[PDB]
Design a protein around this ligand. Sequence first.
Ligand SMILES: O=c1ccn([C@@H]2O[C@H](COP(=O)(O)OP(=O)(O)OP(=O)(O)O)[C@@H](O)[C@H]2O)c(=O)[nH]1
Length: 317
Amino acid sequence: HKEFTKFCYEVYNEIKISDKEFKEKRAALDTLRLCLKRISPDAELVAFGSLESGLALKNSDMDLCVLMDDTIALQFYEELIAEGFEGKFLQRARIPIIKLTSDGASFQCDIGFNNRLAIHNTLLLSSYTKLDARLKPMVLLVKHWAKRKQINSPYFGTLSSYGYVLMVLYYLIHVIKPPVFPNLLLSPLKQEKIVDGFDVGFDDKLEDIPPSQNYSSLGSLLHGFFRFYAYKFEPREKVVTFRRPDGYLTKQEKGWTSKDRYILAIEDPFEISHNVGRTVSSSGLYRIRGEFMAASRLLNSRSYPIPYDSLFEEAPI
Ligand SMILES: O=c1ccn([C@@H]2O[C@H](COP(=O)(O)OP(=O)(O)OP(=O)(O)O)[C@@H](O)[C@H]2O)c(=O)[nH]1
């Protein structure tokens, strides 16, 4: 897997966020943080998602959250419009969202209100990123593949990027032997921490966690990932889980047999009642499995040189 790993790192270095782009987004956060602090001094504007965990590709969108504990949401929107930012305010029932698009760098940022669970799972992925240097390039390459193969559209019957990140994590914890990572949620050193009615606790003392016993290359880890979800993983029977010591959970045990969509079952590490794969339709899953099989077929090809570039060739929309 020497040559494929060489290719993997070549692509990784092209698709990852630049330090310039990251500093630009951090500068943007500080400006937005000032507009909030001038309307509500007790409120805090926190970043979450790819950018915060360091699993972001270049030209990435921002995911921000305003921590409170009530008309502050509309007031903050009005302050941002006054400051010079362009965007819209949207509220469905009691959940407001600010969606910005201008100002002085290129903008495409989303602001949520009290998405505490999201900040916490972003902490979990941040910890794993700090545990092994192979996770960041592996996650970026999977996200680049899913985007290019048109299987990263939740509103079109396929899966979210967060979904793919959990698919990678589950493989690296509970499938690959030796494991790349331990399950931090099930550590004896883990302590319960209830946030919005869910346990967000895990072992965060990474300094005491022994190093990985898995010494495989990035190229090898990726080949295994594709091979696992293409031929071994059966979505009609099993649930992707972070709550079982062996990673073994049937849909029967979970009660996810018949949000009511359980075509592909990815149980969130903290919000265990929420199936991260609820967006995946039957036809969407058919396309996902097809692309996984295609990736596997390519990687074990006996025709040299292997056209590795085809792994990221854009599929018809
Ligand atoms: O089902 C979900 C989806 C997303 N989230 C929360 O929103 C964030 C992911 O939002 P995204 O689904 O957009 O994935 P991503 O940002 O990590 O990668 P890109 O957009 O760059 O393609 C994650 O960090 C997670 O915390 C959930 O909590 N549950």
